[PDB]
Design an enzyme around this catalytic site. Sequence first.
Site, PDB file in Angstrom:
ATOM      1  N   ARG A   1     -17.222  20.681   7.827  1.00  0.00           N
ATOM      2  CA  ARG A   1     -18.154  19.566   8.326  1.00  0.00           C
ATOM      3  C   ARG A   1     -18.070  18.545   7.452  1.00  0.00           C
ATOM      4  O   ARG A   1     -18.607  17.622   8.615  1.00  0.00           O
ATOM      5  CB  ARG A   1     -19.178  20.317   7.329  1.00  0.00           C
ATOM      6  CG  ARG A   1     -18.474  19.301   6.283  1.00  0.00           C
ATOM      7  CD  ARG A   1     -19.701  20.273   4.903  1.00  0.00           C
ATOM      8  NE  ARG A   1     -19.372  19.582   2.833  1.00  0.00           N
ATOM      9  CZ  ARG A   1     -18.240  20.687   2.284  1.00  0.00           C
ATOM     10  NH1 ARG A   1     -18.044  21.915   3.286  1.00  0.00           N
ATOM     11  NH2 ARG A   1     -17.440  20.532   1.743  1.00  0.00           N
ATOM     12  N   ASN A   2     -16.900  17.465   7.348  1.00  0.00           N
ATOM     13  CA  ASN A   2     -16.458  16.407   8.232  1.00  0.00           C
ATOM     14  C   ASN A   2     -15.705  16.021   8.764  1.00  0.00           C
ATOM     15  O   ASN A   2     -15.217  14.961   9.178  1.00  0.00           O
ATOM     16  CB  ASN A   2     -16.044  16.299   6.809  1.00  0.00           C
ATOM     17  CG  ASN A   2     -17.351  16.230   5.583  1.00  0.00           C
ATOM     18  OD1 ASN A   2     -18.348  15.650   5.495  1.00  0.00           O
ATOM     19  ND2 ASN A   2     -17.005  16.376   4.163  1.00  0.00           N
TER      20      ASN A   2
ATOM     21  N   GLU B   1     -17.594   5.391  16.442  1.00  0.00           N
ATOM     22  CA  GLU B   1     -16.981   6.457  17.827  1.00  0.00           C
ATOM     23  C   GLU B   1     -18.152   7.289  18.357  1.00  0.00           C
ATOM     24  O   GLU B   1     -17.808   7.631  17.031  1.00  0.00           O
ATOM     25  CB  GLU B   1     -15.569   6.680  17.571  1.00  0.00           C
ATOM     26  CG  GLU B   1     -14.607   7.304  18.594  1.00  0.00           C
ATOM     27  CD  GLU B   1     -13.093   7.655  18.285  1.00  0.00           C
ATOM     28  OE1 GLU B   1     -13.460   7.473  17.090  1.00  0.00           O
ATOM     29  OE2 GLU B   1     -13.018   8.236  19.002  1.00  0.00           O
ATOM     30  N   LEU B   2     -18.818   7.309  19.370  1.00  0.00           N
ATOM     31  CA  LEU B   2     -19.381   8.747  19.909  1.00  0.00           C
ATOM     32  C   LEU B   2     -18.249  10.138  19.294  1.00  0.00           C
ATOM     33  O   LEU B   2     -17.268  10.136  20.519  1.00  0.00           O
ATOM     34  CB  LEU B   2     -19.904   8.582  20.866  1.00  0.00           C
ATOM     35  CG  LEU B   2     -20.625   9.765  21.358  1.00  0.00           C
ATOM     36  CD1 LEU B   2     -21.727  10.195  20.171  1.00  0.00           C
ATOM     37  CD2 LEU B   2     -21.487   9.202  23.048  1.00  0.00           C
ATOM     38  N   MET B   3     -18.806  11.365  19.203  1.00  0.00           N
ATOM     39  CA  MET B   3     -17.830  12.488  18.951  1.00  0.00           C
ATOM     40  C   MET B   3     -18.345  13.408  19.603  1.00  0.00           C
ATOM     41  O   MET B   3     -19.426  14.182  19.059  1.00  0.00           O
ATOM     42  CB  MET B   3     -17.560  12.881  17.507  1.00  0.00           C
ATOM     43  CG  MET B   3     -16.501  11.568  16.663  1.00  0.00           C
ATOM     44  SD  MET B   3     -14.635  11.645  18.043  1.00  0.00           S
ATOM     45  CE  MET B   3     -15.223  10.124  19.295  1.00  0.00           C
TER      46      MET B   3
ATOM     47  N   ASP C   1     -13.269  15.172   0.298  1.00  0.00           N
ATOM     48  CA  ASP C   1     -13.646  16.207   0.279  1.00  0.00           C
ATOM     49  C   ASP C   1     -13.198  16.722   1.497  1.00  0.00           C
ATOM     50  O   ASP C   1     -14.215  16.570   3.146  1.00  0.00           O
ATOM     51  CB  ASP C   1     -15.354  15.224   0.219  1.00  0.00           C
ATOM     52  CG  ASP C   1     -16.890  16.509   0.809  1.00  0.00           C
ATOM     53  OD1 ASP C   1     -16.383  17.711   0.320  1.00  0.00           O
ATOM     54  OD2 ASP C   1     -17.365  16.066   1.135  1.00  0.00           O
TER      55      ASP C   1
ATOM     56  N   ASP D   1     -16.256  11.541   8.008  1.00  0.00           N
ATOM     57  CA  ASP D   1     -17.214  11.606   6.916  1.00  0.00           C
ATOM     58  C   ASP D   1     -15.878  10.920   5.884  1.00  0.00           C
ATOM     59  O   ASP D   1     -15.825  11.263   5.121  1.00  0.00           O
ATOM     60  CB  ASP D   1     -18.326  12.419   6.777  1.00  0.00           C
ATOM     61  CG  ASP D   1     -19.080  12.365   5.676  1.00  0.00           C
ATOM     62  OD1 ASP D   1     -18.921  12.364   4.568  1.00  0.00           O
ATOM     63  OD2 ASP D   1     -20.555  11.971   5.686  1.00  0.00           O
TER      64      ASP D   1
ATOM     65  N   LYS E   1     -25.403   5.270  12.958  1.00  0.00           N
ATOM     66  CA  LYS E   1     -25.969   6.124  11.621  1.00  0.00           C
ATOM     67  C   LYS E   1     -27.111   5.269  11.393  1.00  0.00           C
ATOM     68  O   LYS E   1     -26.574   4.015  11.491  1.00  0.00           O
ATOM     69  CB  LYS E   1     -25.121   6.126  10.767  1.00  0.00           C
ATOM     70  CG  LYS E   1     -25.365   6.409   9.459  1.00  0.00           C
ATOM     71  CD  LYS E   1     -24.455   6.849   8.967  1.00  0.00           C
ATOM     72  CE  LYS E   1     -24.472   8.179   6.818  1.00  0.00           C
ATOM     73  NZ  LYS E   1     -25.749   9.357   7.892  1.00  0.00           N
TER      74      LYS E   1
END
Length: 291
Positions: free
Chosen positions: A150-151, A94-96, A146, A167, A47
């Site tokens: 989407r998170n 961490e790659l998701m 939240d 997120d 990011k």
Amino acid sequence: NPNYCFAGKTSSISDLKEVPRKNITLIRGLAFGEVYEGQVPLQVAVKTLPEVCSEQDELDFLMEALIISKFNHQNIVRCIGVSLQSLPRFILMELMAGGDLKSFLRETRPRPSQPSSLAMLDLLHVARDIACGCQYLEENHFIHRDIAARNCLLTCPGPGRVAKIGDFGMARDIYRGGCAMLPVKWMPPEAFMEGIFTSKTDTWSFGVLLWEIFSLGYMPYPSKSNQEVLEFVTSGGRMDPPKNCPGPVYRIMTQCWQHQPEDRPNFAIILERIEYCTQDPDVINTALPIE
């Protein structure tokens, strides 16, 4: 430099694991800031912080890094480290590879081409995964604010997939925005009215996530705007069951949406009820609708 407090321990920028920039390579791209697949060989998500940003953006980026680095649970995405000493600044996650849950549900809906792309047990496993993460947050007194599809992120598209909370931008903003950007469709009455947030806040939102999951990625409260939902929910209105949703699953949602927070279950109870659903042959043998 700002400090961050979690589980009664205080951490500083100094405590973040700084990875030398030369050890980091961007491979391909994937709001504010871009996300890349990278390598540190360790595969990661990167990011970035825009070099063209405000002082507040910088502090926000830093705080996100501190928050995520201090969590330690399998259903919360790991922070591998940071590279804050070079520009643009990086946070290494961490790659998701499964991507976000909302997109996944929509893209992977059963189809005449993919008649068995998903089954009820897949959905129950995702729900359990996220509930386990929420339980960890609850027992550590962290309010997410939240919880929504989407998170959440998936480790991979396929059968072994694990869902994780990925997120934390809302919690970050509140720790230190606008009415039109508030996730009102995921919020309980006392939150959008009095601005009171507790662990029971996340329970309500989790109920909405459950609806998102079992609707296979539909937007909550179909055809309603934010204000219409606010008035609907404040007046006792609740969503109908998603198409083909088993009664035991819908019941979990309606419990999460009890008007009084003390009437809503904690996440220990939610997990128990999700587990009981997964055991019930009649629940898991229910076919999902074909798109």
